[PDB]
C-alpha cells in the first residue's frame, strides 16, 4: 500500500492558516494541487482569497450541476489551472490525473477521510506530498488521525511565516 510525503504546519489565525497555503502554493514544486476544506461556505471564499494572492485557483462545491463539475475539472487538467478547492462530497466520484499535492486546510475527524484525500496524489510513480494546516482547534484531530495511520505527520515551519503563539497542551 502506497507512500507519500506528509507534513503539517500549525497556525494561529484563520488568516495565518491561509497565508500558509498561499505561500505553500507559490512554490515551483507545487504542480497540480487539490485543497480540501470542511465547510461548504469556505470553498467559495478560499478561492477568492487565492486569486488575490496571485494564484489561479478553481473552486468546486457539491451542489454544482454535473456540467459545471466538468468545466471546473477540465480547467485543472489544463495548465490553465493548478489549484482545485473542494469538499469531500464535491469531489466524490472523480479521477483527476497527475496530482502532486494534497492539502488539508481543515483537518478531518477520521483517518479514513484523511487517507482518501491524500489518495488523490498520483501514483504515476512519482511521489506526491500531503500537507495539513492545523489550527489549534484541529490539534486533537491531527493526533487522532496520526495514530489511525501508521505514523505521525512530521512538523515543519516556514522561516518568514511563523507561529507567534505556543503549541497546544497534548
Amino acid at each position: 500500500r502506497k507512500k507519500i510525503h506528509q507534513w503539517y504546519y500549525r497556525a494561529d489565525d484563520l488568516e495565518h492558516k491561509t497565508a500558509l497555503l498561499v505561500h505553500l502554493l507559490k512554490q515551483p514544486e507545487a504542480t497540480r494541487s487539490i485543497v480540501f476544506v470542511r465547510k461548504r461556505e469556505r470553498v467559495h471564499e478560499l478561492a477568492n482569497w487565492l486569486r488575490e494572492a496571485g494564484i489561479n485557483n478553481c473552486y468546486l462545491e457539491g451542489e454544482m450541476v454535473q456540467g459545471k463539475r466538468n468545466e471546473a475539472i477540465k480547467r485543472l487538467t489544463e495548465g490553465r489551472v493548478n489549484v482545485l478547492v473542494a469538499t469531500d462530497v464535491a469531489a466524490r466520484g472523480i479521477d483527476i490525473p497527475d496530482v502532486s499535492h494534497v492539502f488539508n486546510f481543515d483537518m478531518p475527524r477520521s483517518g479514513d477521510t484523511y487517507l482518501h484525500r491524500i489518495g488523490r496524489t498520483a501514483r504515476a510513480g512519482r511521489k506526491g506530498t500531503a500537507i495539513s494546516l492545523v489550527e489549534a482547534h484541529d490539534h486533537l484531530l491531527l493526533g487522532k488521525v496520526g495514530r489511525y495511520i501508521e505514523e505521525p505527520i512530521k512538523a515543519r515551519v516556514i522561516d518568514e511565516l511563523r507561529p507567534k503563539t505556543r503549541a497546544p497542551s497534548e
Binding site: 457539491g62 478531518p108 475527524r109 477520521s110 477521510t113 489511525y148
Partner: protein, 158 residues
C-alpha cells in the same frame, strides 16, 4: 412515501430483503436513496465526517458490528445529518436519545437504544462491502425502508 411490500411484489427477486432486526427511531416513516457504507465499531468520528457533507438523496448504511453497548448516533449527530438533507440512516448498532430523534425529519433504523455514546477516535473504513441481516451492502446500491422492513437493490427503482 415508499412501500417496500409493493416493491417486492413488483421487483421480486431484483431486491434483497434484510432480516427483521431493525426498527424506526427517526421522524420520517419511510425513505430511500443511494447508499454510502461504513464499517466501524463503537466509534463515530467517521460518521461525523460523512454526515457533514451533503446527502440529499443518500442514506448512510453503517455496519456497527451489531453492538448495543454503544450508541453511534445521538441527537447531535442526527441534527447534523438532517441539516445536510441526508435521506435516512441504517445502523447495525445502537442509537441514543430516542425522544429527540423521533421529532426529526430524517429516517433512522437501528437495533436498540443505549445511553452511552460511541468513542470519537475516527477508527473505521468507508465505502467498503459490508454484511448484515443477510444482505451485502456496497456504495452505490439503493436502499428503501418503511415500517415493514428494509430492501436494497443495485439500481434505482420505480
Amino acid at each position: 412515501k415508499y412501500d417496500t411490500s409493493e416493491l417486492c411484489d413488483i421487483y421480486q427477486e431484483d431486491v434483497n430483503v434484510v432480516e427483521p432486526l431493525f426498527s424506526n427511531f427517526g421522524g420520517r416513516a419511510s425513505f430511500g436513496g443511494q447508499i454510502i457504507t461504513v464499517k466501524c465499531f463503537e466509534d463515530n468520528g467517521l460518521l461525523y465526517d460523512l454526515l457533514e457533507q451533503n446527502g440529499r438523496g443518500r442514506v448512510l448504511v453503517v455496519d456497527g458490528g451489531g453492538s448495543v453497548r454503544r450508541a453511534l448516533v445521538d441527537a447531535e449527530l442526527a441534527r447534523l445529518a438532517v441539516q445536510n438533507e441526508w435521506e435516512g440512516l441504517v445502523i447495525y448498532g445502537a442509537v441514543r436519545q430516542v425522544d429527540d430523534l423521533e421529532e426529526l425529519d430524517i429516517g433512522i433504523q437501528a437495533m436498540a437504544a443505549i445511553p452511552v455514546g460511541a468513542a470519537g477516535e475516527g477508527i473505521g473504513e468507508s465505502d467498503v462491502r459490508v454484511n448484515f441481516g443477510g444482505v451485502t451492502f456496497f456504495s452505490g446500491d439503493h436502499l428503501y425502508a418503511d415500517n415493514t422492513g428494509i430492501i436494497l437493490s443495485e439500481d434505482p427503482l420505480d
